[PDB]
């Protein structure tokens, strides 16, 4: 059972498949947050060429919730979900940012290339199935000293085409 969604940004759109079959809690949380428009106006605030771009931080929203929460009632962090068939290989892997074991809230990254040292440290919960060339343009974005793009792509909306929960 998979979820399907489009992230529409000020600098391109991404078509995404969610692995609700292998990472149900992370997909559910994400879709519950999509439901209440949580990601609208958030940016992609960290971008490293040949690695990944990172988004989903409530605290950096350029505007409802001011701090980062999960999609579940209460907003508490949720546990990691790993699967051997899901590895940080190649462009367009959708995965969870964290600060150690079981600290998943709302921040995520999309890979520009393999980074398999992250396997079994980060919940991979999807992949970009369309818009790989938007991603390739993001990879070229000029960034400051802290790796924030000078012009961060900002989420206009997320269109959910299928939520299996």
């Amino acid at each position: 059972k998979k979820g399907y969604l489009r992230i529409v940004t000020t600098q391109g759109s991404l078509n995404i498949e969610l692995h609700a079959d292998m990472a149900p809690r992370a997909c559910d949380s994400f879709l519950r947050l999509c439901a209440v428009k949580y990601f609208d106006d958030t940016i992609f605030h960290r971008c490293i060429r040949n690695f990944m771009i990172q988004g989903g931080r409530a605290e950096l929203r350029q505007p409802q919730s001011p701090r980062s929460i999960s999609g579940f009632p209460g907003g508490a962090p949720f546990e990691d979900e790993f699967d051997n068939r899901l590895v940080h290989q190649g462009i367009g892997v959708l995965s969870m940012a964290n600060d150690g074991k079981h600290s998943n809230l709302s921040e995520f990254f999309i890979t520009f290339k393999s980074c398999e040292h992250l396997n079994n440290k980060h919940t991979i919960f999807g992949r970009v199935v369309g818009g790989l060339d938007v991603l390739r343009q993001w990879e070229k974005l000029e960034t400051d000293k802290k790796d924030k793009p000078l012009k961060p792509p900002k989420v206009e909306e997320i269109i959910v085409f299928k939520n299996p929960f």
Partner: peptide
């Protein structure tokens, strides 16, 4: 190094 953290970016 090459991490994806939320607050303390490490090497």
């Amino acid at each position: 190094x090459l991490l994806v953290t939320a607050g303390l970016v490490l090497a």
